[PDB]
Enzyme design. Sequence first.
Site: not given
Ligand SMILES: O=P(O)(O)OC[C@@H](O)[C@@H](O)[C@H](O)[C@@H](O)CO
Ligand SMILES: [Mg+2]
Lengths: 219, 219, 219, 219, 219, 219
Positions: E63, E173, E30, E197, E34, E135, E65, E32, E6
Amino acid sequence: MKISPSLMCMDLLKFKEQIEFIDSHADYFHIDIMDGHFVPNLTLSPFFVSQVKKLATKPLDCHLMVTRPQDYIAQLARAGADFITLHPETINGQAFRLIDEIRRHDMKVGLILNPETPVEAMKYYIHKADKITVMTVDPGFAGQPFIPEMLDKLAELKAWREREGLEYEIEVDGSCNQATYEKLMAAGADVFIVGTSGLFNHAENIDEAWRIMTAQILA
Amino acid sequence: MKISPSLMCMDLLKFKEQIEFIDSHADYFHIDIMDGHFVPNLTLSPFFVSQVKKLATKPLDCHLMVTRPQDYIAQLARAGADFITLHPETINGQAFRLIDEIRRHDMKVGLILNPETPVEAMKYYIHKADKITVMTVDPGFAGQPFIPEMLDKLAELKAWREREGLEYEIEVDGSCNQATYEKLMAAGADVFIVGTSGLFNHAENIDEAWRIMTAQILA
Amino acid sequence: MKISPSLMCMDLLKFKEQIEFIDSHADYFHIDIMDGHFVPNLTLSPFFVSQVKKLATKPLDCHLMVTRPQDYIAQLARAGADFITLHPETINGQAFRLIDEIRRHDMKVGLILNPETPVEAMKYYIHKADKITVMTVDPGFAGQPFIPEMLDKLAELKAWREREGLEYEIEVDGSCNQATYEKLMAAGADVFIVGTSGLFNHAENIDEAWRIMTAQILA
Amino acid sequence: MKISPSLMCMDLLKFKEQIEFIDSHADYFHIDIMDGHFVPNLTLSPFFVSQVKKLATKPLDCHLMVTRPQDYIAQLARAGADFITLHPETINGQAFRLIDEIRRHDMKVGLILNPETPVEAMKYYIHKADKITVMTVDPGFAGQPFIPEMLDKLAELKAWREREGLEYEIEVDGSCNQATYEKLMAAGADVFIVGTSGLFNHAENIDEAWRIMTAQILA
Amino acid sequence: MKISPSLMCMDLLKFKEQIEFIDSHADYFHIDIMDGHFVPNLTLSPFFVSQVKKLATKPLDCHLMVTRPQDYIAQLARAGADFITLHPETINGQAFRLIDEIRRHDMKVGLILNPETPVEAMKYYIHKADKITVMTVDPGFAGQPFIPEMLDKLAELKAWREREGLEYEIEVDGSCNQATYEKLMAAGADVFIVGTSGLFNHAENIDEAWRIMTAQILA
Amino acid sequence: MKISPSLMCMDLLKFKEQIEFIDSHADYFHIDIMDGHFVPNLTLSPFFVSQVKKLATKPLDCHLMVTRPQDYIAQLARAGADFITLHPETINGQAFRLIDEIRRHDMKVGLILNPETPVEAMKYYIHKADKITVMTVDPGFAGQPFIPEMLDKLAELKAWREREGLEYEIEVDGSCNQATYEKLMAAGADVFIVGTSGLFNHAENIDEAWRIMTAQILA
Ligand SMILES: O=P(O)(O)OC[C@@H](O)[C@@H](O)[C@H](O)[C@@H](O)CO
Ligand SMILES: [Mg+2]
Ligand SMILES: O=P(O)(O)OC[C@@H](O)[C@@H](O)[C@H](O)[C@@H](O)CO
Ligand SMILES: O=P(O)(O)OC[C@@H](O)[C@@H](O)[C@H](O)[C@@H](O)CO
Ligand SMILES: O=P(O)(O)OC[C@@H](O)[C@@H](O)[C@H](O)[C@@H](O)CO
Ligand SMILES: O=P(O)(O)OC[C@@H](O)[C@@H](O)[C@H](O)[C@@H](O)CO
Ligand SMILES: O=P(O)(O)OC[C@@H](O)[C@@H](O)[C@H](O)[C@@H](O)CO
Ligand SMILES: [Mg+2]
Ligand SMILES: [Mg+2]
Ligand SMILES: [Mg+2]
Ligand SMILES: [Mg+2]
Ligand SMILES: [Mg+2]
């Protein structure tokens, strides 16, 4: 058989009188909070919740008929809400986040379905609800035509609860009156949201009105 | 100097008591109707107007802080509103149509400006208003910081009225209290919308609160 | 096999001619009413319905591809609509209210599904429909690619009708032409909404076009 | 004195007849394109433009009463529009971009003001317009009450044009009829958008109607 | 077991370094994108895609969103995207149209489900996807609580693929880390979207972080 | 003559390099934060701000081209923003509330005008701004056509500042390059937001690019 009076149907002239009576006779206070957008109308608000809180011991249930329920959780908690009833159709993408926020404010979780929304809509989080409500009338007002088709939804909700070993209460919202009490109980209802046709109309004095309703429920 | 108490600041426990007192002492009932969209909050509604109507003789003024004021005119008229105060920022494309509809329901016309909206916004229809109000605080809540800059707007509104030979009353909304009464009157205010800091806070008993307010207005 | 010509595909130069021909040969007039919001386009309107009404005896079916179908029911009834076809995706929270309003105006009820909307969406009110339509193309225009996957939806709709003992007609909307007639009939279609590729294109003169279409339907 | 008939007021039964007559007698074709959102109604669309194009030589003027005028420029050009009339209230943040796009498609630029919108709204791009129109009625329908206050706007528009040395034509939209012709001309109008009350109503036969209108204009 | 880092979690100070490392170790990028509307946040954009493109050979997965995915397809193709992952909840009425447009730009199709959206939502077009993502956290941010309930969705997705003979990859995800790797693989995951994480946190140097992750995946 | 590089135009491959260079040569970091709604595009975000913060000493200026600027103030402060530039067209009803919130977070206040927005829009709060920016291009992208008409706005802004005794800096946004430097300075500009055509394009190495720009500014 639990009762939850719809405060948008009460008489403000006798506010204190009616709230105190309701607090010692009913199980919940049903407080409708509308958007003017999610439903075409406006009724109660945090202000109102705050006023009822001054006299209540029974839980205040806030039915969130709003586009952005996220905007009202903290405000409602501080006003004194004990139950936040969410519309599944307004929480796609945030159901788990909101349910957690509601719990964080020490409030119980309610889920309410519009007539055209199937119970599966809540399949992934139905087990997090303390109470699930079935609209038996398209949301927005009092005195709307009862929707018989909703009886199946009540039944499905009861079956689902047994089959899954859940403990949520099943509430009914919309035209809960003498003409429907029987069918609703047979279908699986645990709580009745009582408004104008089921309570307030029976008499100008709320004691009398409550007696009439209670008596009609007996059958 | 006219007074219009902000009902979203009243005590529902003493609803009847306070409405009757207000009805025999004030000039208007200021009823805030919010969207949760035009302003980030929810307060009163047609239901509240309807309740106040049971005891009122003085005019009920409904301040429409909503995205679609068109949706509330007929409903508010039936509830008993006497004044419909419109936000110029929500009526571009329908100001004349709505003003005509309000008149058709035998209600008076009010115009209310957000702090950042200039008076010219109303230039083509300012002459159709019975009362024009100046927000001295960004809309939505009670207890917000007073905006001194609005004093010029009040003055401009007074000058405009004289120069054009109009007869509208000039109202003030937002933090009308001891710290602002003087400046507001000097600027040209005719009506004070009094809320928590100007009225209700002064005393738990509304009679006392009112004499305290009335006394402070004297200066 | 019933036919419902898509008027957004007709020739206005020969308006009277084509409407009269259609009125004595087809079963319905398919009138697309778009929002520019629910679908990215604009086509017909109440004005158009009103004009067709002057010459029609066959029912005018108004396909409401709009965000707020509630805003058009009374207006469409006045213009002369006989059928109001609603999109389930625009009536959550008001399906029963709107269906009742449509009946109150003495009009028949139609239900139309976007390609990605499952038939269960209508489970609680499917029995209130006189006609159910399946979009075989994403809504908005003429000449879009046929979606084979929709054949299963047609079949499911037919099975549902038998299993539930309902009497609704099954309509098809989108690329109803020589290349699809067979599959559509086999799947369970009762009505064909015919547009450019199925009717109007075959010939400049509508008599000829209808002949060619009728012949192709034979297979 | 130029004339621009409002096609949303024409008779489709005599489409070809009326378009050809208008094309050889009027100066422009006024085509209203509505959103159901910017104004609460739906009338014409690109489809209509396309049909009128088959018979027109005079310019087709598309009045864009829509929330997203950006979505219709290329489509309208393709359909045969010659003029795109934009609402300043829908182009903040994109006026120059859209005007450039309209020019790239070889179309003329029109600017139309809602009754409550001041002329300064266009101050930074008024010089890029071929025609500027003044709504003398809140947008959306035919047969609305004339707004006398708009006479000042027409005058201001004329003064602005002279003082700045511009060449735009000044058009009037809304209740252009016998009762207003005089005042409008005195105020500075160059073009009349004629609808039901000014043209079509006078007679079922358009030749006769045009005669009656022309005669009334004489005074 | 495929990996898709990500990028909204990467370190821009070492942009080139991290992209090149990822390009030679991971399977997808990946990205994102938004709206601030579909989800309450803003992260990456076409600009960002464009930069990553300069160094990438592995596919860039965008992705979406956003409320209007239609507005970004051509722009993203242009910026260098290889995968466009759509939210079923934003494409009702345009799923087939958009999937076709994505293919017309030579990009692969991705489908991503919000926690509360059932897999059937994609039933009519699931067979057009190259990759389907689940998700496991309500969309919008990094570091949100894992949603165990989503394990059933992963399993259902795997079962559906086998039963239907499809070939889509199953992606996860949200909180893909040491605490969830096992359960996710058991449920049916093929691809892990790794963020703070699961990857970046383990070490300031990305090589080290990647080894630690790879090792943890081993179990 | 102050310089504020538009980071949406930088090269991420040399992120650290370019930020450090900019931090020791420019006066501000111009960070565009878009909605996809207020303007039709997406660029930077709080994430980006956060990254730049790691290396910056000069102030980070966040240009909020979003529908709900209220949603980003606390988040941006947290990320390290020093300047929040608001669009007057997105703060009617909350300008004073937001300006106070920005100050509460110890950030400076910026005001930016779309080409079609007059300076009076800010008349009641212009004195609360540290910097006022004039878009010389309709917002959303890089490389758009310069709008000469904006020169008058710059001049008016300078005159207003003198006449009122204010101290705000006057910034220019959009096509600040060799072809406009002169006119802009003559008009009254104090700060240049430099993007692709004014800086980054001149050379792949930022030192060289800056040298060329600085030299061109000399005239
Ligand atoms: O939960 P983590 O380990 O901090 O990872 C973060 C990723 O899941 C998060 O950035 C994901 O790509 C997004 O589409 C969520 O809206
Ligand atoms: Mg995503
Ligand atoms: O139908 P009745 O007897 O008039 O009762 C009215 C109540 O159902 C009603 O106010 C309910 O609380 C609302 O949530 C409906 O939108
Ligand atoms: O500022 P105060 O003394 O708390 O008074 C509160 C009132 O101004 C306030 O409720 C007003 O009616 C509303 O229209 C403001 O959105
Ligand atoms: O696909 P064809 O032959 O061009 O026909 C076109 C018609 O299907 C089409 O206009 C239909 O009425 C619309 O409701 C689709 O949104
Ligand atoms: O007022 P009349 O004579 O009925 O004319 C009607 C026309 O003004 C009207 O259709 C106009 O074109 C529309 O743009 C108004 O929204
Ligand atoms: O016009 P140029 O030289 O390509 O510069 C581009 C910059 O003006 C531009 O990115 C600006 O920061 C944005 O706020 C415009 O919406
Ligand atoms: Mg309720
Ligand atoms: Mg008020
Ligand atoms: Mg149709
Ligand atoms: Mg018009
Ligand atoms: Mg900028």
